[PDB]
Design a protein around this motif. Sequence first.
Motif, PDB file in Angstrom:
ATOM      1  N   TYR A  21       0.898  -1.166   0.000  1.00 11.26           N
ATOM      2  CA  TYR A  21       0.000   0.000   0.000  1.00 11.26           C
ATOM      3  C   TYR A  21       0.929   1.206   0.000  1.00 11.26           C
ATOM      4  N   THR A  22       0.900   1.986  -1.059  1.00 10.09           N
ATOM      5  CA  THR A  22       1.757   3.170  -1.177  1.00 10.09           C
ATOM      6  C   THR A  22       1.033   4.441  -1.661  1.00 10.09           C
ATOM      7  N   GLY A  23      -0.297   4.389  -1.627  1.00  5.08           N
ATOM      8  CA  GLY A  23      -0.984   5.586  -2.019  1.00  5.08           C
ATOM      9  C   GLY A  23      -1.364   5.609  -3.488  1.00  5.08           C
ATOM     10  N   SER A  24      -1.223   4.505  -4.150  1.00  4.77           N
ATOM     11  CA  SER A  24      -1.606   4.462  -5.553  1.00  4.77           C
ATOM     12  C   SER A  24      -3.104   4.802  -5.790  1.00  4.77           C
ATOM     13  N   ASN A  25      -3.266   5.594  -6.824  1.00  3.54           N
ATOM     14  CA  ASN A  25      -4.557   6.008  -7.251  1.00  3.54           C
ATOM     15  C   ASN A  25      -5.220   6.926  -6.233  1.00  3.54           C
ATOM     16  N   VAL A  72       4.740  14.163   1.542  1.00  2.00           N
ATOM     17  CA  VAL A  72       3.581  13.326   1.252  1.00  2.00           C
ATOM     18  C   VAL A  72       4.081  12.081   0.431  1.00  2.00           C
ATOM     19  N   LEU A  73       4.952  12.320  -0.571  1.00  2.00           N
ATOM     20  CA  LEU A  73       5.392  11.194  -1.353  1.00  2.00           C
ATOM     21  C   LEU A  73       6.199  10.202  -0.548  1.00  2.00           C
ATOM     22  N   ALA A  74       6.946  10.768   0.373  1.00  5.27           N
ATOM     23  CA  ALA A  74       7.781   9.896   1.173  1.00  5.27           C
ATOM     24  C   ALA A  74       6.905   8.901   1.908  1.00  5.27           C
ATOM     25  N   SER A  80      -0.904  10.446  -6.267  1.00 15.43           N
ATOM     26  CA  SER A  80      -0.895  11.407  -7.355  1.00 15.43           C
ATOM     27  C   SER A  80      -0.952  12.787  -6.768  1.00 15.43           C
ATOM     28  N   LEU A  81       0.094  13.547  -6.853  1.00 14.40           N
ATOM     29  CA  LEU A  81       0.129  14.905  -6.277  1.00 14.40           C
ATOM     30  C   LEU A  81      -0.417  15.939  -7.227  1.00 14.40           C
ATOM     31  N   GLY A 220      -0.164  12.064   3.749  1.00 15.65           N
ATOM     32  CA  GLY A 220       0.303  10.872   3.145  1.00 15.65           C
ATOM     33  C   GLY A 220      -0.369   9.656   3.765  1.00 15.65           C
ATOM     34  N   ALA A 221      -0.467   9.639   5.097  1.00 13.20           N
ATOM     35  CA  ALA A 221      -1.138   8.613   5.851  1.00 13.20           C
ATOM     36  C   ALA A 221      -2.510   8.321   5.287  1.00 13.20           C
TER      37      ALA A 221
END
Length: 266
Positions: A21-25, A72-74, A80-81, A220-221
């Motif tokens: 889980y890395t924040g995709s989409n 946030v990316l970290a 998607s920023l 990011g969380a």
Amino acid sequence: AKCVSYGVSQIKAPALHSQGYTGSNVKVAVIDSGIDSSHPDLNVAGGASFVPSETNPFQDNNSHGTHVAGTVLAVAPSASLYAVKVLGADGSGQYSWIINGIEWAIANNMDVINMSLGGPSGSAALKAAVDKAVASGVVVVAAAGNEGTSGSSSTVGYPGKYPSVIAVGAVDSSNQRASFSSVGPELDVMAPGVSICSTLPGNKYGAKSGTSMASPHVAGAAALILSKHPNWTNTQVRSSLENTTTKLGDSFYYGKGLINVEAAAQ
Ligand code: NA
């Protein structure tokens, strides 16, 4: 070479990353001084500038937004920023620019909004915008402010002060509240915000301290949580961030404590 905040592991993000889980989409709007999308390590999916004198949101003359975005990316490397520039080069912006950027984020269906910004006076229109963004289902996160204390008075700034907003204080690597972290009953949770290494304009990195650095870790969380649970609402995202924190000191200074993303994502 490069760097990554110690905060990513402090909030337990690596566990989620390790689980895919890395924040995709997830779309995160970084409402701030723009984002230098030229940075090799940052990919910016879209955005808008509301600073009349700076028409390119992809250019960040202050470095504030790039750093924030880097955080946030970290925490959510696949997010998607959106660079939503509401602060000019001198780091300052009109409340109207900020509302405009919030509106843009609602209209453009952002999943999360990060506002590493604040001012001391409230505005109904700002309140209305954040309230509408939450009603629209966006997770809204903001820096609590870097105003220290003033007795028993709340020093949380706006918009972080609005109950619809998740106002984030900052702690250091030992979980100690930072001397500058705003306090008051409106503080919701804490995240690392001292000497946080992040991306800077010009394929650079650097450290900054502030609730502005804490905020993006919670944004990011949210993103990581959404990538695992794409159908949860902001309400659920928010409550889980809030209910799974690591309790630290008193609410007035620490909110419910430090965020624990691994626990939050269930
Ligand atoms: Na709040």
